[PDB]
């Protein structure tokens, strides 16, 4: 050696002062060698500071300081972190191009992450520097607002207590950006706004933090209800749609992000809001005035409600078991809302159906065998009919892999549901699945179908293995036909399909050659 490579870099740094474009490659090589992790380190630090001092070589010094922060020894880091932080803060107010600001913010995020784990350095950095760093981040140019957000995020991730004094001001910086047409800026603003309740001291074992979190969630729910009522009552409709999406994404991020203190999650209120959003399908809108614009905007509102439901499911887990009835009534309702051809082409509303099937898969994942999916009732029957319609192939301009992606999502949902709830599932469902899937796997190996994509074939083989693994106790699965299908698929050209078929054949050998006598 490390000393030899470090001395090499110090000596051949004279190319900079032209190997500036080569500097990132050399720097990746230096961190790959692990030479950093001390006269050589001190010389590198001094050269980095000298480069940062100038206004034309700031990129080189910033890269050097990025490497230093990345792989400093715990001794060098403690003694030089304050100087590096001051240099980064000074660079953050230089009227530099936004790429320099982005690099400085990334380095600052690394520095703050590595400084928060040193109790002696943490408190010093916090009290003596964090308000100034936040003020500098708030003072960036509009063109660099994106960068500022990451910096703010960093300050709110590792130093939350010291961000409280400016918390309200930070809020003014976030509401302005949650209604932003740029998806990355809007997502980052939502992520920053979701961290507001965690700022401050949080006295009494985070009681203040819990109260702030609950108040923010209730305010977001009220605002979402007002926006939804306004939407369902030209440019203004688009503005309300954007604000609704931003607010709902903020609420979903608050649901599905780490928080310091325990909180009380109102499940009934969020579920009532989701149902209210999903309860306008196609006919309540009608067609008059701005009615067609509402009809155009409706799938985006439905997708945003589905994202909210996904976040709630992730946050709560199996605790939503007593609302599973509502969830299993909601899923086929959304499927019925957006269901509508020539072979090939593409069915409309495919994204909404994929989101619904992902919701189904996630729900089965978090609820295990208690998900209660495809287990009787009108809602389960409707969901199964939609799934079987979306996985069936459609039996001149078009795509060879037509409707492949909804097919793959439905296959994933069906295979997970079968693997986890197959014994509980009725035998007619299993027989229908066999009669639909066995000809499919036999015919994919032997036109324009969803199964021209290898991912769909992999999901179909996964569903076949799930039917073998979790069958009805009263309906034995077709083992020989599935074995033939797996043998055919292990000779397929696609690597993922053949590999899955090999592993599935190993599992089927376990299934076919028992090790202990049965009972």
């Amino acid at each position: 050696g490390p000393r030899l490579r470090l001395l090499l870099l110090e000596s051949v740094s004279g190319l900079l002062q032209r190997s500036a474009p080569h500097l990132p490659g050399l720097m990746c090589l230096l961190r790959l060698h692990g030479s950093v992790g001390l006269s050589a380190l001190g010389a590198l630090v001094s050269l980095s500071n000298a480069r940062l001092s100038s206004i034309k070589t700031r990129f080189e010094g910033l890269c050097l300081l990025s490497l230093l922060v990345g792989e400093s020894p715990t001794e060098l880091f403690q003694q030089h972190c304050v100087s590096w932080l001051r240099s980064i803060q000074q660079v953050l107010q230089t009227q530099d191009p936004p790429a320099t600001m982005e690099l400085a913010v990334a380095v600052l995020r690394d520095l703050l992450r590595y400084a928060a784990q040193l109790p002696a350095l943490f408190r010093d950095i916090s009290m003596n520097h964090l308000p100034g760093l936040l003020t500098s981040l708030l003072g960036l140019r509009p063109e660099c607002e994106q960068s500022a957000l990451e910096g703010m995020k960093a300050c709110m991730t590792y130093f939350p207590r010291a961000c409280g004094s400016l918390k309200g001001k930070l809020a003014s910086f976030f509401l302005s950006r949650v209604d932003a047409l740029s998806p990355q800026l809007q997502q980052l603003a939502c992520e920053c706004y979701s961290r507001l309740p965690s700022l401050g001291a949080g006295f009494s074992q985070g009681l203040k933090h819990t109260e702030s979190w609950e108040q923010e969630l209730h305010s977001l729910l009220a605002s979402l209800h007002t926006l939804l009522g306004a939407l369902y009552e030209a440019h203004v409709l688009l503005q309300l749609r954007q604000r609704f999406s931003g607010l709902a994404r903020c609420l979903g991020l608050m649901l599905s992000s780490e928080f310091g203190a325990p909180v009380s999650v109102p499940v009934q209120e969020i579920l009532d809001f989701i149902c209210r959003t999903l309860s306008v399908s196609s006919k309540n809108i009608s067609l008059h005035g701005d009615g067609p614009l509402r009809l155009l905007l409706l799938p985006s509102i439905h997708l945003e409600a589905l994202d909210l439901l996904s976040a709630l499911i992730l946050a709560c887990g199996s605790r939503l078991l007593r609302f599973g009835i509502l969830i299993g009534r909601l899923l086929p309702q959304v499927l019925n809302s957006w269901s509508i051809l020539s072979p090939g082409q593409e069915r409309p509303y495919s994204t909404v159906r994929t989101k619904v099937y992902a919701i189904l898969e996630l729900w089965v994942q978090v609820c295990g065998a208690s998900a209660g999916m495809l287990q009787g009732g009108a809602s389960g029957e409707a969901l199964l009919t939609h799934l079987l319609s979306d996985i069936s192939p459609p039996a001149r301009k078009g795509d060879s892999n037509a409707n492949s992606d909804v097919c793959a999502a439905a296959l994933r949902g069906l295979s997970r549901t079968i693997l986890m709830c197959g014994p509980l599932i009725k035998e007619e469902t299993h027989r229908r699945l066999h009669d639909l899937v066995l000809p499919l796997v036999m015919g994919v190996q032997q036109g324009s179908s969803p199964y021209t994509s290898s991912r769909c074939r992999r999901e179909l083989y996964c569903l076949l293995l799930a039917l073998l693994l979790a069958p009805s106790p009263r309906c034995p699965p077709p083992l020989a036909c599935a074995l033939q299908a797996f043998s055919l698929g292990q000779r397929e050209d696609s690597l993922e399909v053949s590999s899955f078929c090999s592993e599935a054949l190993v599992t089927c050998a376990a299934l076919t050659h028992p090790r202990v006598p049965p009972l």
């Binding site: 990025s66 999650v265 605790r319 007593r322 295990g368 065998a369 014994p423 509980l424 202990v516």
Partner: protein, 361 residues
């Protein structure tokens, strides 16, 4: 299996009500005092709380794993508590209150449902591995299999019904054991009719039935279900090999050394070590292969509870505190939770950093 521990309670409980001691050491890792836990009335909630149904009382006491005499608040019940269990995921608490089963959710403490399908007092409650189903046995000689989904999602107008009703036993059920899994799990029941029955949860069918010459007061199986250990009413433990509906055990497969009825049976993770608590005021530790008593521990009364379990970080860390306090469990018929290891790896952060560096250029 890092430091398997044995958790034992007796009836007298002069100075200690519960004792947690290392299997191969025997030193008291942890102690608890305050009451007298009843049979089948000991549970670990979420790996961080110790719930004990008090013997002959109408309430359930609670302890923290790291604090002695940590009895603070009680779970009031309308009648006497006969059995108590907690779901392995730590989300629900079942108590057998007389002939009924009370279900509480640990998230809120609400009494979610009171199932009154048994016409006699409930003797034992068990969960499956994934908490999808729970099995109840009572002195009504019935074994009921309940789907948690059906029980939780029931309109109070239409009372929940058991997924399965098993009435093949002729005498009151004394113990239940559930294997790993949910629908694919198997349940072992033992009765005073000197019979141990193995059922399949999903099909509801009777897979096996073994008849003994004495009443079977306890039953357990290893995780791989290689064997089945049945503790009888005369201090004799029988081993039945599940590798061989309607058998009939007849007497090299039996453990000798207990005097009174063996009421608690537990198997270590590897299945080489067996724990047995009896009414002779003794917990014995046996080598499964050689049928030889490794260890004998004397208590001050008849053993009501005894189990082998992997010690969580709670029992090992002397500074452990529960993440959430125990809620107030309502006596009559949002979600409190912590919202939230997917941290970016090292080429995750490095690739982000060099993407930024390249984007500068």
């Amino acid at each position: 299996a890092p430091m398997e521990v044995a958790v034992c309670t007796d009836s007298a409980a002069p100075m200690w009500s519960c004792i947690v001691w290392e299997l191969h050491s025997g030193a008291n890792l942890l102690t608890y005092r305050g009451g007298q836990a009843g049979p089948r009335g000991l549970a670990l909630l979420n790996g961080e709380y110790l719930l004990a149904a008090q013997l002959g009382k109408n309430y359930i006491s609670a302890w923290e794993l790291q604090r002695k005499d940590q009895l603070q608040q009680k779970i009031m019940c309308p009648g006497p508590v006969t059995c108590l269990t907690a779901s392995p995921n730590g989300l629900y608490v079942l108590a057998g209150v007389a002939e009924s089963i009370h279900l509480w959710e640990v998230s809120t403490g609400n009494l979610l449902v009171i199932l009154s399908r048994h016409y006699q007092d409930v003797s034992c409650l068990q969960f499956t591995g994934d908490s999808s189903h729970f099995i109840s046995g009572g002195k009504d000689c019935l074994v009921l299999v309940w789907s948690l989904c059906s029980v939780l999602q029931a309109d109070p107008s239409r009372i929940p019904a058991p997924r399965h009703v098993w009435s093949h036993h002729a005498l009151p059920i004394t113990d239940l054991h559930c294997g790993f899994g949910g629908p694919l799990a198997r349940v072992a029941t033992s009765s005073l009719d000197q019979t141990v029955k193995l059922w399949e949860v999903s099909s509801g069918e009777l897979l096996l039935s073994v008849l003994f010459d004495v009443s079977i007061m306890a039953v357990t199986m290893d995780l791989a279900e290689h064997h089945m250990f049945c503790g009888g009413s005369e201090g004799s433990i029988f081993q039945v090999d599940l590798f061989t509906r309607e058998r009939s055990f007849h007497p090299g497969k039996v453990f000798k050394g207990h005097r009174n009825q063996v009421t608690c049976l537990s198997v270590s993770t590897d299945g080489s070590v067996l724990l047995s608590g009896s009414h002779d005021e003794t917990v014995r530790l046996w080598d499964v292969q050689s049928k030889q008593c490794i260890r004998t521990v004397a208590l001050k009364g008849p053993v009501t509870n005894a189990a082998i379990l992997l010690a969580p970080v709670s029992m090992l860390s002397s500074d452990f505190r529960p993440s959430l306090p125990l809620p107030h469990f309502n006596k009559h018929l949002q979600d409190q939770l912590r919202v939230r290891d997917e941290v970016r790896n090292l080429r995750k952060i490095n690739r982000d950093l060099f993407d930024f560096s390249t984007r500068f250029i």
